[PDB]
């Protein structure tokens, strides 16, 4: 049981460690969360809050990066107009628009109806990776905006 699904599984696997840290900070913010590698694509329905925790930029695999999830999104394009999402760790944004437009992932969610709120959250720990720099300040902003 959660108010937010933490969909953390680019290739049916992903940054579950970072998603668990995010999930804990989101429960501390006053909510309940479900750290998942998206085993059902959408454990919470097309209503509520979603978050998507993937690394589409310098580690975005060949097709797009989200091999099962992207095809599943296009297959059903559910009425996400009653939910909002936040991309996290994703680098497609504005900034790795660089060899193509793998922003397709964000675009198809927005087409299906989920507003992106704020802008893509950036996460980092121990060793530099893809978005380079943590954004607990995004988490504070996005929370006090949604309150």
Curated annotation (Swiss-Prot):
Disulfide bonds: none annotated. GO terms for molecular function: FMN binding. The keyword Electron transport applies. It comes from the Bacteria. GO terms for biological process: regulation of cell division. GO terms for cellular component: cytosol. Residues 4-143 form the Flavodoxin-like domain. Its cofactor is FMN. Keywords: Electron transport, Flavoprotein, FMN, Transport. The keyword Lipid metabolism does not apply. Probable electron transporter required for biotin synthase activity. Homodimer. Belongs to the flavodoxin family. MioC subfamily. This is Protein MioC. It comes from Escherichia coli (strain K12). The gene is mioC.
């Amino acid at each position: 049981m959660a108010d937010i699904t933490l969909i953390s599984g680019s290739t049916l696997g992903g940054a579950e460690y970072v998603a668990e840290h995010l999930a804990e900070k989101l429960e501390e913010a006053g909510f309940t969360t479900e750290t998942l590698h998206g085993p059902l694509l959408e454990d919470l329905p097309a209503s509520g809050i979603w978050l998507v925790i993937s690394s589409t930029h310098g580690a975005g695999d060949i097709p797009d990066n989200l091999s099962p999830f992207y095809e599943a999104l296009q297959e059903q394009k559910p009425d996400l107009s009653a939910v909002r999402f936040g991309a996290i760790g994703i680098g497609s944004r504005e900034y790795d628009t660089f060899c193509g437009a793998i922003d397709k992932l964000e675009a198809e969610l927005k087409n299906s109806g989920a507003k992106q709120t704020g802008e893509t959250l950036k996460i980092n720990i121990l060793d530099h990776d893809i978005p380079e720099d943590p954004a607990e300040e995004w988490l504070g902003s996005w929370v006090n905006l949604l309150k």
